[PDB]
Amino acid sequence: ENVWFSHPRRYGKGSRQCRVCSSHTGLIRKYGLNICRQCFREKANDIGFNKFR
Template identity: 50%
Template sequence: MSYERVKKQLANKPAKLARYIKHNSSKKRKFGDITAPCRRCGKKGSVMHKYGLNYCRQCFREEATNLGFKKFN
């Protein structure tokens, strides 16, 4: 069963729901890919965190000129 389905089943039992959430929820991460999804499309992989951009590589290519980046070649 999925996490959301179990939470729905335990909605009427607050003590069991609290215990389930305590032991089965994923821990909050300070570092890594999952911390900041792409601000444009929401993808979690290949996100550029440099300079606080938080764009995935595909969205960055589309938005680079609007952000002030220039292509020299």
């Protein structure tokens, strides 16, 4: 029908989801990562993000 998904999710948290688990709440949109923070820690050393200091 036309009422199932008529709500306009294009300007908020409901319009964005993780590419790994599609989790809400905290995400990392910086540099267009679109990944939530807690699994970002697990896969941090896969994208080239290291920790020296």
